[PDB]
Design an enzyme around this catalytic site. Structure first.
Site, PDB file in Angstrom:
ATOM      1  N   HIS A  60      -9.972   2.205   5.903  1.00 43.65           N
ATOM      2  CA  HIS A  60      -8.669   2.406   6.567  1.00 43.65           C
ATOM      3  C   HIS A  60      -7.946   3.602   5.982  1.00 43.65           C
ATOM      4  CE1 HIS A  60      -9.433  -1.521   8.236  1.00 43.65           C
ATOM      5  NE2 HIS A  60      -9.451  -2.050   7.029  1.00 43.65           N
ATOM      6  N   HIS A  90      -1.767   5.213  -1.633  1.00 50.12           N
ATOM      7  CA  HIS A  90      -2.641   5.673  -0.568  1.00 50.12           C
ATOM      8  C   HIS A  90      -1.780   6.527   0.341  1.00 50.12           C
ATOM      9  CE1 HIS A  90      -0.670   2.071   0.927  1.00 50.12           C
ATOM     10  NE2 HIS A  90      -0.636   2.771   2.063  1.00 50.12           N
ATOM     11  N   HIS A  92      -1.299   7.925   4.676  1.00 51.60           N
ATOM     12  CA  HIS A  92      -1.587   7.887   6.114  1.00 51.60           C
ATOM     13  C   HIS A  92      -1.476   9.330   6.608  1.00 51.60           C
ATOM     14  CE1 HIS A  92      -0.964   3.460   6.074  1.00 51.60           C
ATOM     15  NE2 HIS A  92      -0.177   3.827   5.067  1.00 51.60           N
ATOM     16  N   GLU A 102       4.081   7.556   9.110  1.00 46.23           N
ATOM     17  CA  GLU A 102       4.401   6.236   9.702  1.00 46.23           C
ATOM     18  C   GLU A 102       5.907   6.145   9.986  1.00 46.23           C
ATOM     19  OE1 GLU A 102       2.275   3.248   7.218  1.00 46.23           O
ATOM     20  OE2 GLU A 102       0.929   3.402   8.956  1.00 46.23           O
ATOM     21  N   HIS A 115       2.268   6.409   0.163  1.00 54.78           N
ATOM     22  CA  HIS A 115       2.817   5.095  -0.163  1.00 54.78           C
ATOM     23  C   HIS A 115       2.397   4.692  -1.570  1.00 54.78           C
ATOM     24  CE1 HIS A 115       3.126   3.974   4.355  1.00 54.78           C
ATOM     25  NE2 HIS A 115       4.112   4.749   3.941  1.00 54.78           N
ATOM     26  N   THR A 194       2.497  -2.083   6.568  1.00 56.42           N
ATOM     27  CA  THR A 194       2.289  -1.365   7.838  1.00 56.42           C
ATOM     28  C   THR A 194       0.855  -1.521   8.335  1.00 56.42           C
ATOM     29  OG1 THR A 194       1.589   0.753   6.907  1.00 56.42           O
ATOM     30  CG2 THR A 194       3.997   0.383   7.187  1.00 56.42           C
TER      31      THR A 194
HETATM   32  C1  LIG Z   1      -1.364  -2.652  -0.186  1.00 56.04           C
HETATM   33  C2  LIG Z   1      -0.940  -2.508   1.250  1.00 56.04           C
HETATM   34  C3  LIG Z   1      -1.481  -3.322   2.285  1.00 56.04           C
HETATM   35  C4  LIG Z   1      -1.018  -3.131   3.594  1.00 56.04           C
HETATM   36  N1  LIG Z   1      -0.086  -2.176   3.836  1.00 56.04           N
HETATM   37  C5  LIG Z   1       0.386  -1.432   2.818  1.00 56.04           C
HETATM   38  S1  LIG Z   1       1.592  -0.212   3.187  1.00 56.04           S
HETATM   39  N2  LIG Z   1       0.876   0.821   4.234  1.00 56.04           N
HETATM   40  O1  LIG Z   1       2.674  -0.941   3.828  1.00 56.04           O
HETATM   41  O2  LIG Z   1       1.969   0.453   1.921  1.00 56.04           O
HETATM   42  N3  LIG Z   1      -0.020  -1.565   1.567  1.00 56.04           N
HETATM   43 ZN   LIG Z   2       0.644   2.621   3.638  1.00 55.83          ZN
END
Ligand SMILES: Cc1ccnc(S(N)(=O)=O)n1
Ligand SMILES: [Zn+2]
Length: 256
Positions: A60, A90, A92, A102, A115, A194
């Protein structure tokens, strides 16, 4: 679940009904509607002892993971009560420089969004934290394409070794302080993960100031794959959820 036409964001609600919930993320940040809260404390980002361990392609995005077994890299202050410990970051990003973030700002999309995920230490670990309405704090940072971000390059250079889903690599001694803009001015609101499971456990803190990264840096993000090794190539691009309804929420600003 994924980001394609047949398994992407408009499909997620079938396996994860909270997708249509009351505090989903991301959202558009309408900068004129956001309320300055002179009450909000300065954000405290204390990453001086952050210990990275590994970088992983999870199909992902890619995660840089941290040793969160001690209070080493913590976020506190701002809207937060108590202490939140960094577990991973990570990104996006898009297929084009015109999309990828996002959150949006007055409907503007950035090329990518970072993030930095933190969990509330009152809940003892990440798995318990995500079951709580104040379990996580995610620090979101926009990326624009322009000058290179030198502190990003070590991430960029290791991506060739984790091209496909399931691959991981040693990634010690990475300093996430090199990914932060000058200003810690921010917007904050209650929201969600998200990606699935979309749990409504996040205090979002989105920095106003983007970082600049080079075209060459983001082009290397776009060489990653959604698929596993030996499978047909699907480039890892456009792994962003679009803005969700704000519903009964107010976005607060730390600045005027
Ligand atoms: C660890 C994790 C899982 C799902 N989503 C996110 S996020 N994209 O909201 O930071 N982080
Ligand atoms: Zn994220």
């Amino acid at each position: 679940w994924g980001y394609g036409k047949h398994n992407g964001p408009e499909h997620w609600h079938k396996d994860f009904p909270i997708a249509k919930g009351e505090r989903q993320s991301p959202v558009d940040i309408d900068t004129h509607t956001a309320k300055y809260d002179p009450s909000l404390k300065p954000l405290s980002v204390s990453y001086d002892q952050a210990t990275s361990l590994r970088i992983l392609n999870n199909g992902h995005a890619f995660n840089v993971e941290f040793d969160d077994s001690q209070d080493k890299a913590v976020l506190k202050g701002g809207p937060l009560d108590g202490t939140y410990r960094l577990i991973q970051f990570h990104f996006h990003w898009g297929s084009l420089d015109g999309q990828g973030s996002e959150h949006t700002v007055d409907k503007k999309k950035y090329a990518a969004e970072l993030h930095l995920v933190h969990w509330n230490t009152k809940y003892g670990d990440f798995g318990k934290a995500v079951q709580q309405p104040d379990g996580l704090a995610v620090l979101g940072i926009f990326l624009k394409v322009g000058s290179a971000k030198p502190g990003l390059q070590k991430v960029v250079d290791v991506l060739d070794s984790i091209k496909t889903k399931g691959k991981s690599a040693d990634f010690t001694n990475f300093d996430p302080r090199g990914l932060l803009p000058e200003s810690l001015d921010y917007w904050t609101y209650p929201g969600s993960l998200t990606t699935p499971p979309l749990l409504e456990c996040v205090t979002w803190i989105v920095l106003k100031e983007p970082i600049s990264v080079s075209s060459e840096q983001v082009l290397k993000f776009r060489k990653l794959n959604f698929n596993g090794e030996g499978e047909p190539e699907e480039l890892m691009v456009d792994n962003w959820r679009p803005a969700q309804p704000l519903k009964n929420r107010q976005i607060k600003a730390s600045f005027k």
